[PDB]
Structures are given as C-alpha cells and as structure tokens.
Amino acid sequence: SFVEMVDNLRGKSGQGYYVEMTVGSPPQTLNILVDTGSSNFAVGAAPHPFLHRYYQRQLSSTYRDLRKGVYVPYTQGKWEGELGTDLVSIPHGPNVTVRANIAAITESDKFFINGSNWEGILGLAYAEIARPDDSLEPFFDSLVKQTHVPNLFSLQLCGAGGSMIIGGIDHSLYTGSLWYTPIRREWYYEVIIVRVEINGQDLKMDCKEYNYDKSIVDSGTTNLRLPKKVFEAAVKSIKAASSTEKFPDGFWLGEQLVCWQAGTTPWNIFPVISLYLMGEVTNQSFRITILPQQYLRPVEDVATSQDDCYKFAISQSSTGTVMGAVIMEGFYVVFDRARKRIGFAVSACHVHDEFRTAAVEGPFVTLDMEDCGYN
Ligand SMILES: CCOC[C@@H](Oc1cc(C[C@@H]2CS(=O)(=O)C[C@H](NCc3cccc(C(C)(C)C)c3)[C@H]2O)cc(F)c1N)C(F)(F)F
C-alpha cells in the first residue's frame, strides 16, 4: 500500500535523499541515493573511507557476474566497477523482489560523500543514458517488466525526509491541482521551460535559451542549475531585488555561506522565481513558484548552528537546465512514464511564510508559437 511507502526517504541537506534497499541473498541492507538524473544502479562494493558498509558479492548466492566493466562520469564525481545481476528489494516500497543489473563500485573519485549515510545510487531515468550503453536495463524497467507494478513513480522530497511512491499517486501527499508537462524525450526526464520570471518580471529571453541544451528533472542534484546566459540574468535580477543587503561574490558562486542571527533571515528581500513549464496542450503552460526558502539552502553543520546559515543553491550549468532537489522540494512530483509526462502539485510539506507560498498554477497562454525545445 502507498500508506506503507510514506516517509520512506531520508536525507541530509545538500547530501541527497536516500531509500533503504536490499541486494543479494541473504539480503544485504544498504541506503541508496534516489537519482532521477541517471540510469545506473550502483553500490559500493569495496572498502572506502566514507563507506559505513558495502555490498559483499561473495556472500550472495544469487549474484551473477556479467563479465563486463562499467564507468560512470557524473558532472561531479565518478566511479568504476564490475557489472552483475542480483536480487533487489525495497523494504518500504513495493512488496516484490526483482533481479536487476547492479554495478559493483570498486574505485571512485568524489562520488561518495562523507557522512551522507548512503552507499549507492539508484538511477531512475531511461536506458538511453545508461552506461556502458543503452543495452543495460535500468532498475525501474526491470521492476515493471518482472512485477507488473504500474509504470509510474512519484517523489515527495521535503526540506529541513520524504516519500517515494512506486506504482501510483498518493493523494494524501498533495493539495490542489496536479499539472502535467510532457516528457520531451525518454532519456533524462527532459522537459521544456517556456518562460522564467523573477518576482513577476519576465527575463525576456528567447525561450530556447532556457532549454540549452536540455532541461531535466534531477533528484540527485542539489541545486537549480541554469545555462550560462540564464544564470547571469537570474543572478542580476536576484541581486537587484535583494540590494538592500550586500553579499560576498563567493556567495553568488554558491561556495560561501551567508548567516543571519537566529530567526532573522530577511526572506522578504529575496524574490520568488517562477518557472513556466510546457503544458500538455499547445502553447499552454503552468508555473511552479520557487521561494528563497528553497533556493537558499540551509546548512545543518553543528559548528554553524548558533545562527541561520545558507548557501545559494542556484548554479551555472554548461549542460543545460537542471531542476534539482531544491526545486523539487515542497512539490509532489509524478513521474508518469506510462503517459510520458511529469506532474507537479503542491505537496504536504510545501514551503511558505506569512506572505508567500510555493505554488503550482495554470493554465497560462503564450502568443508566440515558437517551439521552446532546443533539440
Ligand atoms: C557534487 C555532490 O552533490 C551532492 C549529491 O551527490 C552526488 C550526486 C550524483 C548524481 C548526479 C549529480 S550531477 O550534478 O552530476 C547531475 C547528474 N545528472 C545529469 C548527468 C550529468 C552528467 C552525466 C550523467 C550520466 C550518469 C548519464 C553519465 C548525468 C546526477 O546523476 C553523483 C555523485 F557523485 C554525487 N556525489 C547528492 F548528495 F546526491 F545530493
């Protein structure tokens, strides 16, 4: 039941959201990063300074070596390993066990994060972007093929963990309307942004710029990442709105903290960002609104805990727009693979203060009939 699946995610700020999984027979328990931005299932399989535990293939009598190596370079972080298959379950997910491809990570560089409490990654996107190539069936494809669980999952990520509901939509997790944007191509979860506003002010760019060279929904990525030209415009606009206070250059590069005395964070001086997503109907769109409570990410370090400190969680990208965790937080996001669309609604843990609230609103109509896809 979906009720059993609620609150099955945990996480630390800036360190992803993970779900408990078991691999092998007898089951070995691991925490696994939920990542809609990749398509490989991979687990630590040898000692590493940042690993609390790892997958021991020799103790699983159901493990099969595929006799193939694999290497995955992310934007930040990389690992290499050996491919195999084994039995996998999700204790607080569907009540099924399936045989899936698993990469056993034997060497890595800046992949594992000290203290994150996860030991592997679950790539939930499509085979087209799997390594070594698209012939390696991703986990979710295996799950659907072997169990006839409906071809859909949803994520409710909550900020300072959340729920991954497999096989359907849990209405207890959102309010208001669920708005759908088409998946443009089944590789990443690619979507189209048709308009961007900062505090109600249109950035006024050709809408193709927002999607150079793609826009994706990516739960494994912390920040909102924007194409260079869009990032520069966004920062200028956010700077203009918050000009009553000055921040270090390092802050806007996402590197340095800004801190305020406990409870005094001036949320009002920071603008709301509206991302308008292509709708299911021609030239219609809906917007999701992003508050500073989302794009100023709280740090949870005990050493900094006397005050409220934040990192600027918007970053420049060279590989397109990435709608990462800080964007997904507070929304219920439905990955409706069966109907090739992604849904957004305000979730039960949506961000708000007395003046403003995260929202999903539509429909909006645009006069210009240009296709915003970069292609
Ligand atoms: C930097 C730490 O952030 C915290 C971050 O940790 C990681 C998260 C990921 C998943 C990545 C994060 S990313 O920023 O690299 C974008 C990428 N999705 C798009 C993409 C870009 C490039 C290549 C590919 C492939 C896999 C299709 C080849 C896919 C995701 O999957 C890999 C890592 F190693 C680490 N640690 C977390 F903790 F999860 F929040």
Side-chain angles (χ1 to χ4, degrees):
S1 67
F2 298 167
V3 183
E4 297 176 336
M5 301 181 73
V6 174
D7 296 349
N8 62 357
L9 302 181
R10 296 185 60 216
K12 298 193 165 173
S13 182
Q15 295 167 49
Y17 292 81
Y18 58 88
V19 66
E20 183 173 285
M21 303 186 71
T22 68
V23 179
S25 305
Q28 298 177 38
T29 298
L30 296 175
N31 285 329
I32 304 299
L33 176 75
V34 177
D35 181 25
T36 63
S38 67
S39 304
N40 283 84
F41 181 38
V43 300
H48 187 280
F50 298 160
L51 282 182
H52 172 91
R53 52 187 176 182
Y54 58 94
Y55 174 42
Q56 306 180 247
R57 288 164 282 177
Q58 77 270 193
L59 302 183
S60 177
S61 55
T62 48
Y63 178 74
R64 175 81 192 267
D65 196 335
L66 282 175
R67 303 180 304 156
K68 294 291 181 170
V70 59
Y71 167 72
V72 175
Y74 303 93
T75 302
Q76 183 73 207
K78 65 186 61 177
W79 55 256
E80 244 246 300
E82 175 72 12
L83 289 171
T85 64
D86 208 340
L87 301 185
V88 182
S89 77
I90 304 175
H92 306 287
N95 198 326
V96 300
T97 298
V98 299
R99 181 161 284 271
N101 290 310
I102 303 163
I105 297 171
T106 56
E107 54 190 353
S108 58
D109 177 14
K110 296 157 188 292
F111 176 67
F112 295 116
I113 298 297
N114 181 226
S116 68
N117 207 213
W118 51 262
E119 293 97 35
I121 184 167
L122 180 63
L124 289 170
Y126 300 96
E128 177 62 26
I129 61 174
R131 301 300 183 93
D133 59 63
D134 45 42
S135 77
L136 190 78
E137 182 169 285
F139 173 81
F140 201 79
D141 290 81
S142 298
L143 176 66
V144 173
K145 195 176 291 78
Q146 295 176 35
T147 72
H148 307 288
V149 169
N151 188 17
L152 175 160
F153 66 92
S154 54
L155 292 175
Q156 174 209 35
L157 306 184
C158 297
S163 307
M164 177 174 61
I165 307 300
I166 294 179
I169 304 171
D170 188 339
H171 296 74
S172 307
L173 297 183
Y174 73 97
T175 57
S177 292
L178 190 54
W179 282 91
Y180 288 101
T181 188
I183 297 172
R184 181 163 182 253
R185 178 179 162 195
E186 291 188 359
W187 54 334
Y188 301 95
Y189 289 102
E190 179 185 0
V191 297
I192 295 293
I193 296 168
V194 302
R195 183 185 176 89
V196 178
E197 291 172 342
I198 307 306
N199 256 3
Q201 317 300 309
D202 188 355
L203 288 188
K204 209 136 168 291
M205 292 188 174
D206 184 303
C207 62
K208 287 178 188 292
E209 297 287 350
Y210 300 132
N211 306 291
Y212 165 57
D213 70 301
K214 59 184 180 289
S215 297
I216 68 172
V217 183
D218 187 338
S219 64
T221 299
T222 301
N223 289 2
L224 170 62
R225 303 184 79 237
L226 297 170
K228 165 196 264 291
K229 288 197 174 58
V230 182
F231 176 80
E232 294 172 355
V235 176
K236 294 172 228 153
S237 177
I238 296 171
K239 282 179 163 179
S242 62
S243 63
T244 184
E245 300 188 7
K246 90 276 283 195
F247 310 102
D249 297 333
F251 170 71
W252 299 107
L253 289 174
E255 303 163 349
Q256 183 63 260
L257 295 177
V258 57
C259 307
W260 287 275
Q261 225 175 96
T264 65
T265 304
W267 300 111
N268 294 2
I269 70 170
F270 292 95
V272 171
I273 301 174
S274 293
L275 303 177
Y276 292 71
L277 301 173
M278 177 181 300
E280 298 179 289
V281 178
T282 300
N283 275 226
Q284 286 207 332
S285 60
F286 61 97
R287 69 180 178 206
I288 58 176
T289 60
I290 309 302
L291 273 54
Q293 281 91 341
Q294 281 173 261
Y295 67 77
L296 303 183
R297 179 176 65 77
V299 297
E300 299 166 331
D301 180 359
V302 181
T304 65
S305 62
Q306 186 171 17
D307 292 349
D308 292 334
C309 300
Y310 308 85
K311 285 185 175 176
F312 185 58
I314 308 185
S315 295
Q316 180 172 320
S317 178
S318 64
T319 60
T321 296
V322 182
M323 293 172 63
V326 297
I327 298 303
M328 295 179 64
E329 284 168 22
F331 297 110
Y332 186 54
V333 185
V334 180
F335 294 79
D336 188 347
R337 291 156 56 103
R339 289 164 142 253
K340 195 170 186 173
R341 60 187 188 165
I342 297 181
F344 290 81
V346 177
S347 88
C349 68
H350 74 288
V351 301
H352 67 280
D353 58 31
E354 60 260 55
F355 301 116
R356 299 190 292 205
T357 179
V360 187
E361 301 164 341
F364 293 87
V365 177
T366 299
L367 185 62
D368 182 15
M369 301 172 289
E370 174 200 358
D371 180 13
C372 296
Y374 189 82
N375 195 135

